[PDB]
């Protein structure tokens, strides 16, 4: 099948404004949220119907308890970072863990932390070591690496446990995650440019590029972002500037889910 990924995010805020939670955790399969928890609800809840229908309440009870403890552990860790940064005010602390099951069967695994939206600690499960960006992270690195069993534990979870959860969730929502909606591609004009527009496609992974007379134009092409339409499908575009003094053979190329598409502009 296609490449799929599972990942969990954590967010902590030291001095949040009134109403906003100081801890949030959301899980994703590909681009779909599957789980959620925050310091206000103090409950872990599904974010997808095919998650709520296939996981018994004892599952949500158990992980609610874990996240109440992890919420406190995250509060402790952020207090330690902000004290050693000598930073005052409200600051953020983020964590991302997950894995990918690639098309050819190979797997990847990642775990990293961020402070104020910047890389902080990056785990290398092949050298069993942590990468530190500054001397506050270097202090955390020496403490985490002194517990060799903790590094080994994460390596096993990324390579074995994460992949097994991903396969389990892939089956629960295969009607959503493994479907293909091919895109609707058109061209039009708009000082004159050509816009290649696609919409109504899933999965959101798509490649759009312009070609002039058969050669690629990577430096001159303007790429729009892949945006959610709100109905489970996505849209994107790619423009290019037309030469007013010479005619050329411009053709839009679209790649999506193993199908290549060409639109020649006449």
């Amino acid at each position, epitope marked *: 099948m296609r490449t799929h990924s599972l990942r969990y995010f954590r967010l902590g805020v030291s001095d949040p404004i009134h109403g906003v939670p100081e801890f949030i955790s959301v899980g994703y399969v590909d681009s779909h949220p599957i789980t959620t928890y925050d310091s206000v609800t103090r409950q872990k809840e599904p974010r997808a119907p095919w998650m709520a229908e296939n996981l018994a309440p004892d*599952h949500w*009870e*158990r*992980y609610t*308890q*874990l996240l*109440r*403890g*992890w919420q*406190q*552990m995250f509060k402790v860790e952020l207090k330690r970072l902000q004290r050693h940064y000598n930073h005052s005010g409200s600051h953020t602390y983020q964590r991302m863990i997950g894995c990918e099951l690639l098309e050819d069967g190979s797997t990847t695994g990642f775990l990293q932390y961020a402070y104020d939206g910047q890389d902080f600690l990056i785990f290398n499960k092949d050298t069993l070591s942590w990468l530190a960006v500054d001397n506050v992270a270097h202090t955390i690195k020496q403490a985490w690496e002194a*517990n060799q*069993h*903790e590094l*080994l*534990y*994460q*390596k*096993n*979870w990324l390579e*074995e*446990e994460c992949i*097994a*959860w991903l396969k389990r969730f892939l089956e629960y929502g295969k009607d959503t995650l493994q479907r293909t909606e091919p895109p609707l591609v058109r061209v039009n004009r708009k000082v004159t440019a050509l816009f290649c527009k696609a919409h109504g496609f899933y999965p959101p992974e798509i490649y759009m590029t312009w070609m002039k007379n058969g050669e690629e134009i990577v430096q001159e092409i303007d790429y729009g972002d892949i945006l959610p339409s709100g109905d489970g499908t996505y849209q994107a575009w790619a423009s290019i500037e037309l030469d007013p003094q010479s005619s050329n053979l411009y053709s839009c190329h679209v790649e999506h889910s193993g199908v290549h598409m060409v639109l020649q502009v006449p």
Partner: antibody
Amino acid sequence: QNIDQPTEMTATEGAIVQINCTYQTSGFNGLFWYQQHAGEAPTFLSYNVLDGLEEKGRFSSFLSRSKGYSYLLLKELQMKDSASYLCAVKDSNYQLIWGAGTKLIIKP
Amino acid sequence: NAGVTQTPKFQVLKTGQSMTLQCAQDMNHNSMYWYRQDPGMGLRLIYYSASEGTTDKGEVPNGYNVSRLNKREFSLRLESAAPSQTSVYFCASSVWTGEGSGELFFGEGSRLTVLE
């Protein structure tokens, strides 16, 4: 969920003894060995989560994730090693499953 | 420096009597547990406290209840004692729960015998 270890084992002072532990779990997050003398509290011995053998003094512990199998190797046995040795596996939800324990008897 | 302290070390009880077992730890741990040990079985969790301010049922919660008094103390409560509850009760603590390879630190143990 299932974990098994022999009820009781007898070896001679100065010999070597290997205490086995097999587990059938959904997911695996580590295997612990604990030592419990008669009438007292269990204390932590070793931890394995990746395959191989970890040596620590007279004791060493092995893990095979594929076979769902671990053993605790006690070398140069002494009378003070007479105790129960408990096996515990952490499952996919980080819940500990405990084996019944293995009472080790040392003949002097 | 005292580790895990639980009291009482021994107790006889008549069927239907109330009882409360105490457990404290001066190690600044967050997770605390109550186990019962029986001949021929592995340890069975009764109740656990992932951190201060939350508790949840274990494998055998019926006939028991708990109270995470604070960060240090986690007491096991028998409402109406029953002969099946005759057992050795162990309280344990760990730095965190579900966080990797953290081992358990056990208390000395509490031997309960319930008689008609």
